Amino acid sequence: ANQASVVANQLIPINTALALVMMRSEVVTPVGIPAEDIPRLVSMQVNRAVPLGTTLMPDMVKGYAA
């Protein structure tokens, strides 16, 4: 219900390291990576370009295991 996910605050280019300015949280459906994992996501790379407003999913971040 009120579970917030990590949503792209800007387009994030392929193979680019995640920076805090790139990640906002939002209550979106389907649920993706929980918003409390934003600290852990810093400096991990995406394996695909992520458009603005996309929910960050576990399979999109290289090295991500919850």
UniProtKB/Swiss-Prot annotation:
InterPro entries reported for this sequence: AFP_Neu5c_C, AFP_Neu5c_C_sf, Antifreeze_III
What does the UniProt keyword field contain? Antifreeze protein, Secreted
What species was this sequence derived from? Answer: Zoarces americanus
Q: Know the name of this protein?
A: Type-3 ice-structuring protein HPLC 12
Higher taxonomy: Eukaryota, Metazoa, Chordata, Craniata, Vertebrata
According to the entry, every stretch annotated as the AFP-like domain falls at 5-64
A single cellular component GO annotation:
extracellular region
Query: Where is it located?
Result: Secreted
Q: Where is this site: Important for ice-binding?
A: 10, 15, 19, 45
Tissue range of expression? Detected in blood serum (at protein level).
Q: What SUPFAM superfamilies does the entry give? A: AFP III-like domain (SSF51269)
Q: Which family does it belong to?
A: Belongs to the type-III AFP family.
Briefly state the protein's biological role.
Contributes to protect fish blood from freezing at subzero sea water temperatures. Lowers the blood freezing point. Binds to nascent ice crystals and prevents further growth.
